[PDB]
Amino acid sequence: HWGYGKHNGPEHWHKDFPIAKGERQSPVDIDTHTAKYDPSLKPLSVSYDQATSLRILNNGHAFNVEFDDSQDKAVLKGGPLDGTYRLIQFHFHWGSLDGQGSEHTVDKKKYAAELHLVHWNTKYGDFGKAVQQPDGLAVLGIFLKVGSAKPGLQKVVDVLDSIKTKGKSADFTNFDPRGLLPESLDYWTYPGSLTTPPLLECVTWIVLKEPISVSSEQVLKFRKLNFNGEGEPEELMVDNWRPAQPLKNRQIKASF
Ligand SMILES: [Zn+2]
């Protein structure tokens, strides 16, 4: 029964998911002055040319674009990672207002939204096994600021009318996730967690320094989605972000 409201939101999650107060929770504030350049970090390798998108789903918390991860088609390698991580889904977190919506912050700055490209370590064989390992997932996080339209986002924006409510899905084949990336792959990296229940501590976070720009009309369309199911009272899907969590005994490393 978790969500983002006063009564079921992030301040409540620890009662069902005690790891909410754990040692490696996400997101965090990235203090750009404290993050250390790690000259031994490799360039990220983002290999999305064979990505096979299947479906888009309103899960009552966000919308997920899901990929065929039955083989090594779209993978993330390099940077801080050992081995091959397969793309399984992406989703966003966003705000009711342009001044909030991101989960990570940069020197306490909040962006309008944040894109999460979720990958799993193929050495664990399936996604459900991967989330029970400390190096099971790699999530590529990309900030969204409101400015110019992102052309490669518009196919996603166009289909949101067809998945307005919780449990609706639509076929979403032949979507190229390369169109959501900024020019630069400079990043920050730290060990953390899923930012939604069950809050598992299985994620290597890779957060790109360069935001992408989306238009006010693009993010407006995200805010027309509904948290509720069809035939239930309308609740706009806005402010589906977890606030920054204590850094505790962690260092954020910069690739640049
Ligand atoms: Zn996320």
Side-chain angles (χ1 to χ4, degrees):
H1 210 200
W2 71 265
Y4 292 103
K6 175 70 143 181
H7 302 289
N8 62 4
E11 300 313 306
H12 292 269
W13 297 345
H14 71 99
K15 291 177 279 167
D16 291 297
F17 304 98
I19 199 66
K21 297 178 188 284
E23 296 301 300
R24 60 171 281 183
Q25 290 289 293
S26 296
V28 302
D29 178 57
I30 301 166
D31 180 336
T32 60
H33 296 295
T34 301
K36 202 189 180 185
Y37 174 52
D38 185 353
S40 79
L41 279 171
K42 300 162 169 44
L44 214 43
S45 175
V46 185
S47 295
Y48 289 173
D49 50 289
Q50 311 262 56
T52 303
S53 65
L54 290 182
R55 196 178 67 138
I56 192 170
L57 169 73
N58 181 334
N59 59 27
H61 310 294
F63 62 86
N64 286 18
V65 175
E66 294 160 352
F67 290 77
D68 183 356
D69 64 339
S70 65
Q71 309 183 73
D72 281 346
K73 284 174 176 271
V75 303
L76 184 66
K77 301 171 49 60
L81 304 173
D82 289 338
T84 298
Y85 291 67
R86 271 194 210 157
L87 177 66
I88 177 168
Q89 56 109 320
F90 70 78
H91 63 276
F92 304 80
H93 308 261
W94 60 89
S96 54
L97 303 155
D98 296 344
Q100 65 198 58
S102 67
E103 296 210 306
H104 292 91
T105 54
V106 182
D107 297 329
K108 302 291 182 97
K109 174 184 173 76
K110 298 172 161 91
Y111 290 87
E114 186 176 327
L115 166 62
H116 290 163
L117 295 133
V118 180
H119 316 75
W120 57 270
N121 195 336
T122 63
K123 81 189 190 142
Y124 296 122
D126 68 62
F127 181 66
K129 283 294 314 202
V131 298
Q132 300 297 337
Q133 318 301 326
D135 61 348
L137 296 206
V139 183
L140 181 58
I142 304 180
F143 297 117
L144 279 65
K145 69 176 169 82
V146 175
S148 316
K150 190 70 164 181
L153 180 61
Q154 193 61 30
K155 281 186 190 188
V156 172
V157 164
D158 289 329
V159 80
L160 296 184
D161 283 334
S162 81
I163 60 157
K164 178 167 211 199
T165 50
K166 178 178 194 195
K168 293 191 163 308
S169 70
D171 297 310
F172 202 70
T173 60
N174 305 109
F175 181 81
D176 189 351
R178 293 180 295 188
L180 298 177
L181 304 180
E183 291 181 357
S184 179
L185 292 185
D186 292 340
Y187 62 87
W188 296 281
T189 184
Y190 77 94
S193 76
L194 306 180
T195 69
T196 55
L199 299 169
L200 294 167
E201 289 183 340
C202 60
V203 183
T204 302
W205 276 97
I206 301 167
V207 178
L208 293 195
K209 166 200 78 195
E210 187 185 328
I212 59 164
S213 291
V214 304
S215 69
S216 57
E217 292 84 14
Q218 288 181 320
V219 65
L220 173 67
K221 287 197 190 184
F222 284 18
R223 303 182 183 124
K224 292 186 189 233
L225 288 166
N226 284 3
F227 285 124
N228 55 285
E230 182 186 7
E232 297 167 13
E234 181 153 7
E235 316 159 82
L236 295 183
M237 184 180 280
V238 295
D239 294 318
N240 58 352
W241 51 276
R242 187 189 195 191
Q245 301 298 311
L247 191 56
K248 303 205 156 144
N249 190 14
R250 294 180 286 184
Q251 197 157 324
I252 304 181
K253 297 181 207 318
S255 76
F256 60 92

